[PDB]
């Protein structure tokens, strides 16, 4: 391990939460930067995020100068820590940048490893937005959190699109645009997502439904995905119908304004 | 394999079908060797002939395949991008 002794003290104390140690550790020490990092293990953000520890991820957070803290949001949304999603999120990269609303593949030049993970690729695939990840894992709490902030699952762009930007995706690396489209489709999808991403939701995932049945007859590669999407947006359908006690929702719901 | 074969027939196949589904795991054949997959073709394809030629033991072989068409369908799977895809598809 090509760490040193204090280091290894502090990633211990951070991965094991030991607050006061850490406090100690990271207060007024000219060493022990706080991005250090295994060659094939976890930063001390990382570590004090897959074990929920909201007082040692506040405390790494303080620190301006923090590697990979996308990567800590995604961990915490992937999780339930909705407290250590809040805190990440009221970090000053996120508030102050276009980082938290776009993927980690196409935010910036990304030069700085903030969505990175150990070695080599990210935790997740690059095309998955904190959003899209929240609305994956139906996080309701994160979904709606990352909602209040602007963060908006956009909609892909139609199948036979013949846009600069939609054919430039095409032109390379197409399974990871197609991989893309149905990661965008499950994040628009979800029962949480769709029940709180904007006003009229039965109506939006009966339309939702259509489009995704339509592209299952298109694609004739992803059916089975496009088919189960879909599902879950007449499942989502049934269930809001379903909950009704009162004749006035029925009607309601069985016609709009 | 001889000497082993006078006596204890049925111990022998059992270290057989052991030793196999010591080769044939997960685990063994993502950290045994490099390129896994190929190797783990190449091992089911063996557990499927051994199934045709034992005819005692063919649950227990056509499992064992089971297991390597599981791992390299599953290998295949994670893949996210098309470097992965054309690397796994075919070798150097
Ligand atoms: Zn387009
Ligand atoms: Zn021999």
Partial sequence: TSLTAEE???LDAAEYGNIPVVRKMLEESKTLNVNCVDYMGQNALQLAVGNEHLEVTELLLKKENLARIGDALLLAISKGY???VEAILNHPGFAASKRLTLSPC???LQDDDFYAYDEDGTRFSPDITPIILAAHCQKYEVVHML???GARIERPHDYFCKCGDCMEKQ???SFSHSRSRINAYK???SPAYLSLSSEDPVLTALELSNELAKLANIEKEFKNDYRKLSMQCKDFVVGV??????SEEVEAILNGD
């Fill in 8 to 10: 290894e003290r502090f």
């Fill in 82 to 84: 909705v407290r250590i």
């Fill in 106 to 108: 196409e935010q910036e």
């Fill in 147 to 149: 909602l209040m902030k």
């Fill in 171 to 173: 032109r390379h690396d």
């Fill in 187 to 189: 994040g628009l999808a």
């Fill in 241 to 246: 119908l379903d909950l009704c006690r009162d």
